[PDB]
Amino acid sequence: VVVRPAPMESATYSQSSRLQAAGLSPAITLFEKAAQTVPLPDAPQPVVIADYGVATGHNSLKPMMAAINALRRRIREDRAIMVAHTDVPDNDFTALFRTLADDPDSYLHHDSASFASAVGRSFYTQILPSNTVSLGWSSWAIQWLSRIPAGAPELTDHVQVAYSKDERARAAYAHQAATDWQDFLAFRGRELCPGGRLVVLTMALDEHGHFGYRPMNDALVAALNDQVRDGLLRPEELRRMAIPVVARAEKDLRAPFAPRGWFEGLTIEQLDVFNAEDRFWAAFQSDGDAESFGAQWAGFARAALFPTLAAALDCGTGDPRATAFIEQLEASVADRLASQPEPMRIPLASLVLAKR
């Protein structure tokens, strides 16, 4: 009865998350700096790093290595560092453990006293022992709502609430995001060591209050409307489709802390709101390959969003119809964006949080 989003498409996420990787690049610098200065546990207790919202692990390798390299300048080489990667139960943890074993960039291949574990429990509850996490990292994860809000109006003509014209829906999604953010902070506040640091990167609204990805969202909705026109999609199924993602404004991120600056033992040490460089547009300006441009954007949308859309179908998620739906939708979005390539806004927020 509680409707939740779907995890990333395991088969394609590691190959289709270059946008996310490029966008989080500035946050790695913050994370590295946090690792250089954070108070550490008494030797020889293991130093714990937490990665909240790991998916396949591909985009975690660089931030984890940056922290580990920084820590190694401060501690003995034989001292244990434990990385706890967290996601939802239905995330593909086999893909994660294969990434950690097989990818040359894996920290396990670079540091002989580093260790890996996984936690498959929603990060909107406490999932690690209190006072044990020295360094927390979360990129591209917290924009995902814990649920479609209870009693929220069905998004009749849209898949993203920011583009919806239903005021009741907007408020319901906004309240859910506010409660989710409070919950996330409350439990990270318990998990962090005193003096510990948490670096968060999430989807944001820009200075004008816009969600961004405008041509993408237009292409997506149009491609879905074409499937109902061609009889590939039922009108009821399209009505049910919704992405439980909310992008937060600066004011939304600060809300739990106002006005004294603290919430559940945590404070905002640094906050930045910025637009990530549009690499797909930059590449297109260089090579003029419109088909490639369309394929890059469509692949990004597929791995991250399509499993959630496919969950609304009358058939099963393992049903061949769902696979056909995913592949057709990707090809249609690709064609639409390839026909008229345009730059897009990728609004992000980075935060450094510190525990008392």
**Contact status: 39 vs a second copy (CB under 8 A):** no
Coil, strand, or helix at residue 113? Answer: coil
Cis peptide before 44 (omega within 30 of 0): yes
Instruction: Count other Cβ atoms within 10 Å, centred on residue 277.
Output: 12
**Contact status: 319 vs a second copy (CB under 8 A):** no
Does 123 carry a binding-site annotation?
A: yes
Cβ-based nearer residue to ligand OCA, 52 or 140: 140
CA distances 340 to 16, 79, 123, 224, 295, Å, are: 21, 54, 39, 18, 13
**Contact status: 91 vs a second copy (CB under 8 A):** yes
**CA angle 83-136-263, nearest 5°?**
150
x/- mask, a second copy, residues 104-133, rule CB under 8 A, reads -----------xxxxxxx-----xxxxxx-
Does 59 carry a binding-site annotation?
A: yes
Cβ-based nearer residue to ligand SAH, 17 or 217: 17
Q: Using an 8 Å Cβ cutoff, are 138 and 146 in contact?
A: no
Contact partner at residue 24 from ligand OCA, a second copy, ligand SAH, none, CB < 5 to 8 Å by partner kind:
ligand SAH
Stretch that binds ligand SAH, among 30-38, 81-89, 151-159, 256-264 (CB under 6 A): 81-89
Cβ-based nearer residue to ligand OCA, 124 or 140: 140
Copy the structure tokens of residue 283: 């590449």
* Per-position DSSP letters for 173-241, written without gaps between them: HHHHHHHHHHHHHHHHHHHEEEEEEEEEEEEB--TT-----HHHHHHHHHHHHHHHHTTSS-HHHHHH-
Phi, psi (rounded to 5 degrees) for 245:
-120, 130
Cβ-based nearer residue to ligand OCA, 48 or 338: 338
Does 69 carry a binding-site annotation?
A: no
Please state the residue numbers annotated as binding site for S-adenosyl-L-homocysteine.
13, 59, 87, 122-123, 139
Query: What residues make contact with ligand SAH under the rule CB under 6 A?
Result: 7-8, 17, 20, 24, 53-55, 59-60, 86-88, 91, 122-124, 139-141, 144, 146
